[PDB]
Amino acid sequence: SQAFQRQLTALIGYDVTDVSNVHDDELEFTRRGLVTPRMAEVASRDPKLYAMHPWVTSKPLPEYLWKKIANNCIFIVIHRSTTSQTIKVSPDDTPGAILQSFDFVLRVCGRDEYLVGETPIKNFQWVRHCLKNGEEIHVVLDTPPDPALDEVRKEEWVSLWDCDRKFRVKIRGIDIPVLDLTVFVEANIQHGQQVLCQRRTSPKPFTEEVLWNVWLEFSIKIKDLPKGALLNLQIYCGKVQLLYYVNLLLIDHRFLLRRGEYVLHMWQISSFNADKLTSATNPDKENSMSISILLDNPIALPKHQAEMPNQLRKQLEAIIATDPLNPLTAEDKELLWHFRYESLKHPKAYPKLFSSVKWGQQEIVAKTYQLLARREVWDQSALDVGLTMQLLDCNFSDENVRAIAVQKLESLEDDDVLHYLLQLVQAVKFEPYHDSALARFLLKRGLRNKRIGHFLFWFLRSEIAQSRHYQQRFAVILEAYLRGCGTAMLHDFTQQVQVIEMLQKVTLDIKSLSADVSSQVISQLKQKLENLQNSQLPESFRVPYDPGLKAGALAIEKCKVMASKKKPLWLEFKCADPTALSNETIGIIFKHGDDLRQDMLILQILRIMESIWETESLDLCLLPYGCISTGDKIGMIEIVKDATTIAKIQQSTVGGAFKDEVLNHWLKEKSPTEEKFQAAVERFVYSCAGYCVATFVLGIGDRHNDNIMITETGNLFHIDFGKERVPFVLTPDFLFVMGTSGKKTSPHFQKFQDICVKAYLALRHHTNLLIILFSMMLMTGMPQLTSKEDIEYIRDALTVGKNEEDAKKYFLDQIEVCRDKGWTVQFNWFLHLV
């Protein structure tokens, strides 16, 4: 009867039904509320295309991928059983057209990946992958997968503007189980980041319980309170210092004003952090500080039923023209609002326009909704993700404003959703209420596409497993997905969850036995792994970072604990698919100890940078490997085949000291033919510039060379994204490959500069998008770096306000700063330990 709910809880990692940490029914209200959204998307989804989940794109084929096609022909090798043909086809041919040259369907050899539907083969991502990598398109004639397998289980389920009183709250007192300075309570009325009104209490001596019993009367009137308005209670001591915080929505999910007694358990500090805005309370009731308060005045918020001077218009357009991180003066705001209707014609003015609204004022908000009612330009405008994300950040608490951002997301094809999914999932932390347009948007795009749904699951589970601030919310959303994804997915998820759970235990036990690394622990590992092969590891499970790949039995011989501070497991799996015409294992690094969430964000931005470069016909051969945060301080990473670190190349031919020549003839040896050395050297030139530019922008380029890797075919790539300085790594050994020895300029070194610039200016063309991603990253992902100082790095990095020519100068100077420092920093890392 209810075994399903116990099944669901073990996949989510949290008990949705639990009510030990709440003071209203918003979570439960959101469960019931999310049912329609699910049911509708389940109802309407095409079952045949659902089971096969064809991953396709409407984007044009890039210039560099065309060049790898001769005479509008591509080869496709179909397999029968032991036999195989090799058809010729044109790019624009549909899989129907191709199949009718021989019901069946064309499945990719090795992977649960299908080539079906009315798109030209040039528009499948697998075909674009084969062409990019220079591999041939193998596929096995197969039966379509039964949609009966994807079945879903059968489911069962006084006006506010008429009160001229000033809002007030009573602070009864504060209490803390365990604790010579004094302390007070600060009360703020807030809308987004904006503080509409503020009041303090008189200081008292800080004992383990402190009672005040005061009313704090605020200047704001009850009618002027906007929907979303948080009451934010903070505790300072003292030269002041913040110790604890907590928030309470003054208008609930049913539009009623909040009333009565509350005992709220607070969050402790150790700055803009997403955690500071949460409606959640601390679930640790035994140790947390608690504040007690009283609200009393049932009141309900209603639901809404010339030419301009030459000079002033330019003043307006300069304001619209600035970056998202450029502040607005009171002068700027009054202008933007006065000329309201001129500003509405420009989609780009929107973030700044709605940051000019006085939200603590009933009539202004009313006027603002009349503005949103009259939006023809916005609804017509071409989708701009940069502008869309802006309206979903921490500055916008108004549901109606945020809703026009989601409206624009509706038009994104699936491929583009994948590109932004993680960030949109992190953007849910900025919503005031648990139920929201954004939550529903993610829910249904995941219910429509198995690939989206897969990564949606893992991104949610990641955040539920290591955030007490938002797990309650993310949990509710996950359940809502799992109840729609289909029995075949829930099966697949349950195997993935088990495998990682079995592997965690092994890691806990192993870690204890160490203090470098012995080989008795290597056998102890291989012992327990062999013991897991028959109890109770399933025959097959999907690779969470690459769900097409089913991985089966273990190659116990090749598995080993890594020579590293955290003792990660270096595992290797056989493939479960007989039809895979290869024999390379699946290599996974399983890591317990650290939080991989920051590693995801960075790698996901790397993929966004690629897609940007793609739109300007550029390819810089970045290598963003699979990396999934799977649980509390655990996760999996992809092993890149035929790869080694730049530092280990030094420990061979030198073994403190560094030599220039070494890298070049490491490549020379690993390349058989001369052409392949020359192929592999150019891949190094692209790689290096791409990774140089990309780290400079993100401000993570000054790295230690045991964290830079390279493939035998010359592809460079950074790893592990957890005095005097260098803007990025361009060490003399790299330069040696490029054919410059101190101070020269090779035909290769100049092309490196030629690309570096093209890359940089290309990124610059999407300044706003990158500025807003960076901002969100730091606020939702990295609780270390969150201030004006931190976030404003990228403004400088992308050289806002400068022109295309002067920026080029700026970057080429950064190339020379590196040149001028050689091995100095690299040595200094080594020196500083000693």
Ligand X SMILES: Cc1nc(N)nc(-c2cc(C3CCOCC3)cnc2Nc2cnc(Cl)c(NS(C)(=O)=O)c2)n1
Work out how close the CB of 374 gets to ligand X at its nearest, in angstroms, rounded to a whole number.
50
Span near ligand X by CB under 6 A; candidates 32-40, 400-408, 435-443, 634-642: 634-642
Strand, coil or helix: 301? coil
Work out how close the CB of 763 gets to ligand X at its nearest, in angstroms, rounded to a whole number.
24
Q: Is position 350 annotated in a ligand binding site?
A: no
Binding ligand X (rule: CB under 6 A), the pick from 137, 230, 588, 637 is 637
Nearer to ligand X, 353 or 506 (CB): 506
Span near ligand X by CB under 6 A; candidates 66-74, 368-376, 423-431, 718-726: 718-726
Work out how close the CB of 662 gets to ligand X at its nearest, in angstroms, rounded to a whole number.
17
Instruction: Confirm if 495 and 540 have CB atoms less than 8 A apart.
Output: yes
For residue 576, which of 585, 588, 568, 567 has the smallest C-alpha distance? 585
Rounded distance between C-alpha atoms, residue 443 and residue 331, angstroms: 41
For residue 168, which of 222, 112, 109 has the smallest C-alpha distance? 222
Q: Is position 628 annotated in a ligand binding site?
A: yes
Span near ligand X by CB under 6 A; candidates 311-319, 372-380, 500-508, 715-723: 715-723
Binding ligand X (rule: CB under 6 A), the pick from 153, 566, 668, 802 is 566
Within a 10 A sphere around the Cβ of 615, how many other Cβ atoms?
13
Nearer to ligand X, 639 or 662 (CB): 639
Torsion of CA 289, 476, 260, 171, to 10 degrees: 30
Span near ligand X by CB under 6 A; candidates 147-155, 560-568, 747-755, 757-765: 560-568
Q: Is position 630 annotated in a ligand binding site?
A: yes
Rounded distance between C-alpha atoms, residue 394 and residue 194, angstroms: 10
Nearer to ligand X, 94 or 564 (CB): 564
Binding ligand X (rule: CB under 6 A), the pick from 26, 224, 435, 599 is 599
Q: Is position 14 annotated in a ligand binding site?
A: no
Nearer to ligand X, 482 or 688 (CB): 688
Helix axes 437-448, 471-482, angle to 10 degrees: 30
Q: Is position 222 annotated in a ligand binding site?
A: no
Please give the order of strands across the beta sheet that includes 708-711: 643-645, 708-711, 716-718
Rounded distance between C-alpha atoms, residue 360 and residue 429, angstroms: 23
Element (H, E) at 312: helix 310-321
Q: Is position 624 annotated in a ligand binding site?
A: yes
Nearer to ligand X, 251 or 667 (CB): 667
Binding ligand X (rule: CB under 6 A), the pick from 510, 688, 719, 763 is 719
Work out how close the CB of 553 gets to ligand X at its nearest, in angstroms, rounded to a whole number.
21
Nearer to ligand X, 616 or 720 (CB): 720
Rounded distance between C-alpha atoms, residue 529 and residue 573, angstroms: 12
Q: Is position 592 annotated in a ligand binding site?
A: yes
Which residues in the chain are immediately followed by a break of C to N over 2.5 Å? 102, 157, 179, 238, 270, 297, 305, 515, 655, 722
For residue 126, which of 832, 704, 136 has the smallest C-alpha distance? 136
Rounded distance between C-alpha atoms, residue 695 and residue 302, angstroms: 50
Rounded distance between C-alpha atoms, residue 86 and residue 751, angstroms: 38
Nearer to ligand X, 487 or 653 (CB): 653
# residues near ligand X by CB under 6 A: 19
Question: Segment 312-331, which members bind ligand X (CB under 6 A)?
Answer: none
C-alpha torsion sign, points 5, 9, 12, 15: positive
Work out how close the CB of 199 gets to ligand X at its nearest, in angstroms, rounded to a whole number.
46
**Residue 722 binds ligand X, judged by CB under 6 A:** yes
C-alpha torsion sign, points 233, 238, 241, 242: negative
Work out how close the CB of 499 gets to ligand X at its nearest, in angstroms, rounded to a whole number.
19
Q: Is position 454 annotated in a ligand binding site?
A: no
Nearer to ligand X, 47 or 593 (CB): 593
Work out how close the CB of 607 gets to ligand X at its nearest, in angstroms, rounded to a whole number.
15
Strand stretches in 559-677, DSSP E:
560-561, 569-575, 586-592, 627-631, 634-638, 643-645
Could you give the count of Cα atoms lying within 13 Å of 338 in the half-sphere of its Cβ? 12
Rounded distance between C-alpha atoms, residue 457 and residue 446, angstroms: 9
Work out how close the CB of 715 gets to ligand X at its nearest, in angstroms, rounded to a whole number.
11
**Residue 243 binds ligand X, judged by CB under 6 A:** no
**Residue 643 binds ligand X, judged by CB under 6 A:** yes
Binding ligand X (rule: CB under 6 A), the pick from 25, 384, 614, 720 is 720
Site string for ligand X, 167-206 (x = CB under 6 A): ----------------------------------------
Place of tokens 């604790």: 179
Span near ligand X by CB under 6 A; candidates 27-35, 112-120, 563-571, 606-614: 563-571
For residue 408, which of 428, 431, 390 has the smallest C-alpha distance? 390
Nearer to ligand X, 602 or 618 (CB): 602
For residue 295, which of 217, 240, 380, 236 has the smallest C-alpha distance? 217
Instruction: Confirm if 506 and 569 have CB atoms less than 8 A apart.
Output: yes
Span near ligand X by CB under 6 A; candidates 259-267, 395-403, 578-586, 641-649: 641-649
The encoded tokens of residue 8 equal: 């669901």
Position 438: which residue type? L
Work out how close the CB of 558 gets to ligand X at its nearest, in angstroms, rounded to a whole number.
13
Q: Is position 486 annotated in a ligand binding site?
A: no
**Residue 568 binds ligand X, judged by CB under 6 A:** yes
Rounded distance between C-alpha atoms, residue 264 and residue 247, angstroms: 9
Write down how long the chain is: 834
**Residue 625 binds ligand X, judged by CB under 6 A:** yes
Helix axes 597-615, 674-698, angle to 10 degrees: 110
Nearer to ligand X, 577 or 599 (CB): 599
Work out how close the CB of 551 gets to ligand X at its nearest, in angstroms, rounded to a whole number.
16
Which residues lie below 8 Å from residue 669, measured CB to CB, with a gap of 6+?
A: none
Span near ligand X by CB under 6 A; candidates 384-392, 655-663, 719-727, 814-822: 719-727
Place of tokens 């004006």: 788
Work out how close the CB of 565 gets to ligand X at its nearest, in angstroms, rounded to a whole number.
7
Binding ligand X (rule: CB under 6 A), the pick from 152, 294, 562, 662 is 562
**Residue 645 binds ligand X, judged by CB under 6 A:** yes
Q: Is position 719 annotated in a ligand binding site?
A: yes
Nearer to ligand X, 563 or 831 (CB): 563
Q: Is position 608 annotated in a ligand binding site?
A: no
For residue 63, which of 666, 497, 617 has the smallest C-alpha distance? 617
**Residue 404 binds ligand X, judged by CB under 6 A:** no
Position 205: which residue type? P
Nearer to ligand X, 625 or 811 (CB): 625
Q: Is position 775 annotated in a ligand binding site?
A: no
The 8-class DSSP code of residue 660 comes to S
- Per DSSP, helices labelled H in 699-766 are 732-738, 747-764
**Residue 591 binds ligand X, judged by CB under 6 A:** yes
Instruction: Confirm if 30 and 427 have CB atoms less than 8 A apart.
Output: no
C-alpha torsion sign, points 402, 404, 406, 408: negative
Site string for ligand X, 274-313 (x = CB under 6 A): ----------------------------------------
**Residue 564 binds ligand X, judged by CB under 6 A:** yes
For residue 646, which of 705, 714, 711 has the smallest C-alpha distance? 705
Q: Is position 339 annotated in a ligand binding site?
A: no
Nearer to ligand X, 93 or 638 (CB): 638
Question: Segment 332-361, which members bind ligand X (CB under 6 A)?
Answer: none
Q: Is position 801 annotated in a ligand binding site?
A: no
Rounded distance between C-alpha atoms, residue 280 and residue 632, angstroms: 20
Nearer to ligand X, 316 or 600 (CB): 600
Binding-site positions for ATP read 587-596, 622-630, 717-722
- Applying CB under 6 A, which residues contact ligand X? 562, 564, 566, 568, 589, 591, 599, 625, 637-640, 643, 645, 648, 709, 719-720, 722
